[PDB]
Amino acid sequence: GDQRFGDLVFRQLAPNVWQHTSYLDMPGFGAVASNGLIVRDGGRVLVVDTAWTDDQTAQILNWIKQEINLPVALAVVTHAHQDKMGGMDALHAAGIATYANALSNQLAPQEGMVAAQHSLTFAANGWVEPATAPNFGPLKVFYPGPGHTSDNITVGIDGTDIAFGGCLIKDSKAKSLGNLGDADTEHYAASARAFGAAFPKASMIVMSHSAPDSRAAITHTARMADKLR
Ligand SMILES: Cn1c(=O)cc(CP(=O)(O)O)c2ccc(C3CC3)cc21
Numbered sequence: 001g002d003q004r005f006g007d008l009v010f011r012q013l014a015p016n017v018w019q020h021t022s023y024l025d026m027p028g029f030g031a032v033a034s035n036g037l038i039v040r041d042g043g044r045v046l047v048v049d050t051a052w053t054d055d056q057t058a059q060i061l062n063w064i065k066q067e068i069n070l071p072v073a074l075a076v077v078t079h080a081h082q083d084k085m086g087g088m089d090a091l092h093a094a095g096i097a098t099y100a101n102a103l104s105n106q107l108a109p110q111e112g113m114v115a116a117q118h119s120l121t122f123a124a125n126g127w128v129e130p131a132t133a134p135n136f137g138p139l140k141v142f143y144p145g146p147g148h149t150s151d152n153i154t155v156g157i158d159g160t161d162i163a164f165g166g167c168l169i170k171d172s173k174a175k176s177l178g179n180l181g182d183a184d185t186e187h188y189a190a191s192a193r194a195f196g197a198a199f200p201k202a203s204m205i206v207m208s209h210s211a212p213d214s215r216a217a218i219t220h221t222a223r224m225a226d227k228l229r
């Protein structure tokens with residue numbers, strides 16, 4: 001069920017997992033949805049991605065207060081664009097520890113974003129260096145290589161069938177790869193397939209801008225990227 005809470009929408013995906021959705025008008029595009037995640041890990045909550053704005057991100061924290069009423073231990077942001085990083089100051093005002101790809105933090109200022117407090121680094125095969133992601137509990141963080149951006153990262157939730165490609169993965173009906181502006185058309189297809197191979201148990205693929213999809217979103221994305229090589 002899609003729970004309306006001020007101008008945002010919350011949908012439960014699993015017993016301990018919810019999707020947050022926020023909207024931003026843009027001319028030529030309409031009121032664009034952006035999704036992130038909320039995970040309960042025992043007596044704390046973990047957030048993946050801000051909303052577009054501080055006010056929206058403050059409303060996510062208000063929804064967590066009312067519907068979960070446990071402290072938010074940390075948030076991880078999946079790339080340095082407004083839809084996933086626009087509410088960083090709201091997280092910092094709430095005393096929430098914040099994490100992003102080192103490259104996301106490096107890009108933040110030129111992208112008009114506020115950097116996270118902590119930088120994630122990755123091994124050669126894409127898995128997060130554990131020292132950089134302390135206390136992440138069931139959040140598994142994977143850098144698939146460059147795609148929608150150079151810095152895009154992905155998350156799976158241990159003990160669920162859920163993984164989140166952020167803006168790397170398009171829905172199975174999408175007509176294009178969308179934002180080519182900061183994209184890596186050469187490496188995109190390999191990056192999409194690497195996400196799939198990182199999270200083989202994830203039957204539910206949470207989309208950046210639409211409803212959850214099947215792993216057909218991953219194949220469709222890879223095939224669309226194969227055309228741009
Ligand atoms: C026009 N437009 C932007 O300038 C920025 C975004 C956010 P991202 O680049 O992270 O997808 C964005 C996201 C989705 C859409 C959809 C209506 C096509 C447009 C968007």
Ligand SMILES: Cn1c(=O)cc(CP(=O)(O)O)c2ccc(C3CC3)cc21
Pocket residue numbers: 148167168170176177178179180181208209
């Ligand atoms: C046409 N179009 C889409 O269908 C989907 C998106 C969002 P994403 O890059 O995450 O797929 C999208 C994002 C940005 C743009 C921007 C150039 C303004 C177009 C887009």
Ligand SMILES: [Zn+2]
Pocket residue numbers: 079081148149167179
């Ligand atoms: Zn983006």
Ligand SMILES: [Zn+2]
Pocket residue numbers: 083166167179208209
């Ligand atoms: Zn996007």
